[PDB]
Design a protein around this ligand. Structure first.
Ligand SMILES: *[C@@H]1O[C@H](CO)[C@@H](O)[C@H](O)[C@H]1NC(C)=O
Ligand SMILES: *[C@@H]1O[C@H](CO)[C@@H](O)[C@H](O)[C@H]1NC(C)=O
Ligand SMILES: *[C@@H]1O[C@H](CO)[C@@H](O)[C@H](O)[C@H]1NC(C)=O
Ligand SMILES: *[C@@H]1O[C@H](CO)[C@@H](O)[C@H](O)[C@H]1NC(C)=O
Ligand SMILES: *[C@@H]1O[C@H](CO)[C@@H](O)[C@H](O)[C@H]1NC(C)=O
Ligand SMILES: *[C@@H]1O[C@H](CO)[C@@H](O)[C@H](O)[C@H]1NC(C)=O
Lengths: 227, 312, 76, 34
């Protein structure tokens, strides 16, 4: 427990340091902000577009042109700028659809990760997910995904089953490892070898059918109590 | 599942004018219209690149299959890369790439990730799943016999691992038969890859209709700007040329809008493909009908010219 | 400028010197070619997909972790 | 597989379960007589 707590605290501090130091860690929100700013800027800038008229200022054309002739230019400007605003609205709709998809993904991640323990490989971060913590952002949500990453792997020789008393034995919830010359039972994701016994193994079939079976003894907890 | 589309770029001045000096100056009076269209097209291209990277770059290391390709009787020849042909693609990959097949200012940029590198990524993922099972996707890759990996995957579907060992040969034979049948199904099927064909055909049709739309005169006397410049004095020519420019600009804006919508759809498809890869190839999914019909055991990825094929 | 020229699928790159060893993709160009600034001048190279390692797969060999590290990461 | 105490667990009496049936459950330690 102490080592795990220390690792968690150190990694939280590492997140703090990375966020403080990383230049573009939060690009996924600055990108949206910049997109909105650019959309507004291009909408405003296209206001000055001439659209083929003599001048882009309505008061100037109304002064240097007669109503019969200024009407065509006013129509040109109005049509062009209505088209510009319609294009801006369409782009805003597309961006809103993208943001809605992102928000749906964020809500699903919150539900699966924060409020539970998702069994999906990469939905709550790389590795075996344990828990996640949500953090608010100006235009988004920041998730701190806690995951269990195995380390310090050691190679061992294993057999699919153990043959004892002419019967094949399989691991109930473990894995057979030989340590070179002594067979044991260990859990898949951690090295906790244990003596082979009827408690942690189940018997099914004979030793001939199983391919790769090896010879080893199975301890009976009730065997010593002969008397 | 489609992943990426063609990265298209449009030249404004030549598209509107077809390389005519006179109307090129007139197009400046319209303002900064197609700075926006160029920006949108560039964004779409970068989005396609990001889609390909996310879908195929999920593995940090390029795992290599061992020279001794014995896996308890299982035969992955149809999916493993072929060391003889220069393409280094698998038989199913070669079949997939063979089935599907495919200026006035319109050009197509090449993708960042080439077919060879995508095939290399697929081979790395295949080697990882064959040699280490779930482990490579959750941290350090751990060696394990394929028979034991299959037994573990059986435990995930509520079936005791003893079933595999007492029927290992039969299961391996059925797996080989199914893998062989996939090749025949893909070859004989007329529209097995209908989605990638549809994507490519949609792109080609959009390009063609954008090109074809220029011949439309939009109510003008003629659709050739050179003739208007030559045989008409400017006072009656500015209006006609402006109308033609407006029509072509509207056509280009419509094309860019449709391209954006299709890019959003393909982005959704690529996100789904990446999710499927993560939950099927890099792990076992308990979700029903997600990694194929029936209880999911494992999935294998295969490269396609514009998508990914999953053998569930 | 014409100082250097190098052909590529997406065109030809002028002002960059091609290198025969791969690095991580810094500035993508296309067709697997990426550009970066390294000791100094702009260089062009084929992007590297990552380190290559082969697991020692065997019929009766398995690797089991002996320790763990609960690494926490951030998502935006 | 034969019904034994290893693959079965006890919870309450018989009269609270609808559709319960009468059958024998073999105790692996019974013949041992340790
Ligand atoms: C594991 O193997 C080593 C060397 O082969 C041996 O010294 C040790 O005793 C073995 N473990 C046990 C619990 O016997
Ligand atoms: C595979 O390993 C098992 C268990 O060690 C062994 O019984 C079997 O003979 C081995 N087979 C081959 C072909 O190495
Ligand atoms: C295991 O031991 C039995 C006798 O107890 C023997 O008949 C059999 O050949 C042995 N198996 C191996 C693989 O040595
Ligand atoms: C795998 O299948 C292919 C195609 O049927 C065949 O050519 C090859 O010999 C098979 N490999 C083995 C080891 O049987
Ligand atoms: C790169 O190295 C290969 C193998 O040594 C050689 O054939 C090729 O000519 C080299 N190219 C350059 C540009 O150095
Ligand atoms: C089961 O056995 C008990 C005791 O012999 C008896 O009281 C009960 O009626 C039996 N139930 C049925 C359904 O036969």
């Amino acid at each position: 427990q102490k080592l795990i707590a220390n690792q968690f605290n150190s990694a939280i501090g590492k997140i703090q340091d990375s966020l403080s130091s990383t230049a573009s860690a939060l690009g996924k929100l600055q990108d949206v902000v910049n997109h909105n700013a650019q959309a507004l800027n291009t909408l405003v800038k296209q206001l000055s577009s001439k659209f083929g008229a003599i001048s882009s200022v309505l008061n100037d054309i109304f002064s240097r042109l007669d109503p019969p002739e200024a009407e065509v230019q006013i129509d040109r400007l109005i049509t062009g700028r209505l088209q510009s605003l319609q294009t801006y609205v369409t782009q805003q709709l597309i961006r809103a659809a993208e943001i809605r998809a992102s928000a749906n993904l964020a809500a699903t991640k919150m539900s699966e990760c924060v409020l539970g323990q998702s069994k999906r490989v990469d939905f709550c971060g790389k590795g075996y997910h344990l828990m996640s913590f949500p953090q608010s952002a100006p235009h988004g949500v920041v998730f701190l995904h806690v995951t269990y990453v195995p380390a310090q792997e050691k190679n061992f020789t294993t057999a699919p089953a153990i043959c004892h008393d002419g019967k094949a034995h399989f691991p109930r919830e473990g894995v057979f490892v030989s340590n070179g010359t002594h067979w044991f039972v260990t859990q898949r994701n951690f090295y906790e070898p244990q003596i082979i016994t009827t408690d942690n193994t189940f018997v099914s079939g004979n030793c001939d059918v199983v391919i790769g079976i090896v010879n080893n003894t199975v301890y009976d907890p009730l065997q010593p109590e002969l008397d | 599942l489609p992943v990426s589309m063609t990265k298209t770029s449009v030249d404004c001045t030549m598209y509107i004018c077809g390389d005519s000096t006179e109307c090129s100056n007139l197009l400046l009076q319209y303002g900064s219209f197609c700075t926006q269209l160029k920006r949108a097209l560039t964004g779409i291209a970068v989005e396609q690149d990001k889609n390909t990277q996310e879908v195929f770059a999920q593995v940090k290391q390029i795992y290599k299959t061992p020279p001794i390709k014995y896996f308890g009787g299982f035969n992955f020849s149809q999916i493993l890369p072929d060391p003889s042909k220069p393409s280094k693609r698998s038989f199913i990959e070669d079949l997939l790439f063979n089935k599907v097949t495919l200026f006035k200012g319109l050009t197509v940029l090449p993708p960042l990730l080439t077919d060879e590198m995508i095939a290399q990524y697929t081979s790395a993922l295949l080697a990882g799943t064959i040699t280490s099972g779930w482990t490579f996707g959750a941290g350090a890759a751990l060696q394990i016999p394929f028979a034991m990996q299959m037994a573990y995957r059986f435990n995930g579907i509520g079936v005791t691992q003893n079933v595999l060992y007492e029927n290992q040969k039969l299961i391996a034979n059925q797996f080989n038969s199914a893998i062989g049948k996939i090749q025949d199904s893909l070859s004989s099927t007329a529209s097995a890859l209908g989605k990638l064909q549809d994507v490519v055909n949609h792109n080609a049709q959009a390009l063609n209709t954008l090109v074809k739309q220029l011949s439309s005169k939009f109510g003008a006397i003629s659709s050739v700007l050179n003739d208007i410049f030559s045989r008409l004095d400017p006072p009656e020519a500015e209006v006609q040329i402006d109308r033609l420019i407006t029509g072509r600009l509207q056509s280009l804006q419509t094309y860019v809008t449709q391209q954006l919508i299709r890019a959003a759809e393909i982005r959704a498809s690529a996100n789904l493909a990446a999710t499927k890869m993560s939950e099927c190839v890099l792990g076992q999914s308990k979700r029903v009908d997600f990694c194929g019909k029936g209880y999911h055991l494992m999935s294998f990825p295969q490269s396609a010219p514009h998508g990914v094929v999953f053998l569930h | 400028t014409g100082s250097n020229v190098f052909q590529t699928r997406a065109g030809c790159l002028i002002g960059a010197e091609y290198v025969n060893n791969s690095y991580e993709c810094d500035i993508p160009i296309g067709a697997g070619i990426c550009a970066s600034y390294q000791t100094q001048s702009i260089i062009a190279y084929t992007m590297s997909l990552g380190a290559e390692n082969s697991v020692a797969y065997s019929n009766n060999s398995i690797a089991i972790p002996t320790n763990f590290t609960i690494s926490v990461t951030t998502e935006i």
